[PDB]
Amino acid sequence: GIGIYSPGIWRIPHLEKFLAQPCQKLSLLRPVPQEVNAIAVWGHRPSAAKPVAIAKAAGKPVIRLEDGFVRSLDLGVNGEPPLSLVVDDCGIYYDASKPSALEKLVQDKAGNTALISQAREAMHTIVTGDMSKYNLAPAFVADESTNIVLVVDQTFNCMSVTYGNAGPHEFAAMLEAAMAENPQAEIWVKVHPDVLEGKKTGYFADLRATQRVRLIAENVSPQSLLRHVSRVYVVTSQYGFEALLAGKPVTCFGQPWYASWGLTDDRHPQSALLSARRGSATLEELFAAAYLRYCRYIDPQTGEVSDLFTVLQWLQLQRRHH
Ligand SMILES: COc1ccc(C(=O)NCCCCCCCCO[C@@]2(C(=O)O)C[C@@H](O)[C@@H](O)[C@@H]([C@@H](CO)O[C@@]3(C(=O)O)C[C@@H](O)[C@@H](O)[C@@H]([C@H](O)CO)O3)O2)cc1
Ligand SMILES: Nc1ccn([C@@H]2O[C@H](COP(=O)(O)O)[C@@H](O)[C@H]2O)c(=O)n1
Ligand SMILES: [Cl-]
């Protein structure tokens, strides 16, 4: 069925439930067996390069996997297995250079409008229930009473930045723009939870904070923090889409999966070309395509094929406890 080289992918519980077909472990030192129809790798991680080369030489297509957008309770870097994966037979969502399976799903407007009730239900649970990709962080504590601008940091070796046509230099450009364009505001630079855990680095290690430019190094749930801000600047973070769900304006310095559909203030030099390729989409079309069609889910108790709604309910149940 599907060949898996990576031992890290192979150990994902219920891998075959996400892929919807049988899977088998392959060795880098043996030929591709005839019974394998496609090879699955993790996005454009460095670990994917050898299996991608082998697939090309063997005449086999590549499927790219990654975490879903509502993934788990604890962080991926803390060894928590995923409850959702993305499955991409074309490219991968974060690679802006060519269409992905997700881009094509977004463009199928009719298939997305069919899902409008499920989209509205899940959107409401995510925002008002304060859910995200990772779900263990407590809510941010603050007075609910319009002068705060959020600048989102990411992880230094994450491929969404690179394949979104960006790198460390766009993080500096983003911060400088947030400062200059909002001279009366406080600028909050939010550090990524993987970096707060000590497992990864970010893009602002050298930043000298000031009275106006502050570091947010508390691990807090995104929707709770978004209630306290007036607008959001990103390079390629998933936070940008979560900020759209929260009703905030979003400025993008990279080319993430949700840029160039008409819903974001796009700053990248390739924005016009990408917008021409993508066209327009509504927020609910983007949400249905990504969260309901592109992402696949398993049941957190039985392991069987599931849906977003079941995963959300479980994650809310586990939170009350924890
Ligand atoms: C004969 O000489 C010879 C033979 C072989 C070699 C050689 O090259 N050997 C090494 C082969 C490659 C070893 C790969 C180790 C396992 C990596 O597992 C994964 C992967 O990349 O496939 C499994 C995935 O499910 C992920 O966990 C990824 C990680 C790291 O690559 O990706 C991220 C992460 O950075 O943490 C990416 C994120 O976007 C996110 O998905 C997170 C996730 O939440 C979990 O943390 O994974 O590892 C030489 C010589
Ligand atoms: N600075 C950041 C960036 C991301 N995040 C979290 O990490 C998830 C994934 O975002 P990235 O695409 O930035 O890795 C977000 O959904 C959110 O839970 C955060 O909480 N603070
Ligand atoms: Cl760079």
Numbering used by the authors: 1 to 145, 148 to 324
From the paper:
Crystals of a ternary complex of KpsC-NEc were also generated using the D160C variant. While the structure of cysteine is less similar to aspartate than asparagine, the cysteine variant converts more fully to the adduct and was anticipated to be more stable on the multiweek timescale required for crystallization. The D160C variant was expressed in E. coli BL21 (DE3) and then crystallized in the presence of 1 mM CMP and 5 mM acceptor 2, a β-Kdo-(2→7)-β-Kdo disaccharide. The structure of this complex was determined at 1.20 Å resolution; notably, this appears to be among the highest resolution structures currently determined for a GT. The resulting map revealed highly detailed density for the Cys160–Kdo adduct and for acceptor molecules in both copies of the active site present in the asymmetric unit. Chain A, which contains CMP, the Kdo-adduct, and the acceptor, is the focus of the discussion below. Cys160 Cα is shifted roughly 1 Å into the catalytic pocket to compensate for its shorter side chain (compared to aspartate or asparagine), and the anomeric carbon (C2) is shifted 0.5 Å towards Asp/Asn/Cys160. One noticeable difference is that the C1 carboxylate rotates ∼90° and hydrogen bonds with the guanidinium group of Arg45. The acceptor disaccharide interacts almost exclusively with residues from the N-terminal α/β domain. The C1 carboxylate group of Kdo-A1 is hydrogen bonded to Lys202 (the only directly interacting residue from outside the N-terminal α/β domain), as well as to Kdo-A1 O8.
KpsC is a dual-module glycosyltransferase (GT) essential for “group 2” capsular polysaccharide biosynthesis in Escherichia coli and other Gram-negative pathogens. Two separate GT modules in KpsC transfer 3-deoxy-β-d-manno-oct-2-ulosonic acid (β-Kdo) from cytidine-5′-monophospho-β-Kdo donor to a glycolipid acceptor. The N-terminal and C-terminal modules add alternating Kdo residues with β-(2→4) and β-(2→7) linkages, respectively, generating a conserved oligosaccharide core that is further glycosylated to produce diverse capsule structures. Based on the formation of covalent adducts with Kdo identified here by mass spectrometry and X-ray crystallography, we determined that catalytically important active site residues are conserved in WbbB and KpsC, suggesting a shared double-displacement mechanism.
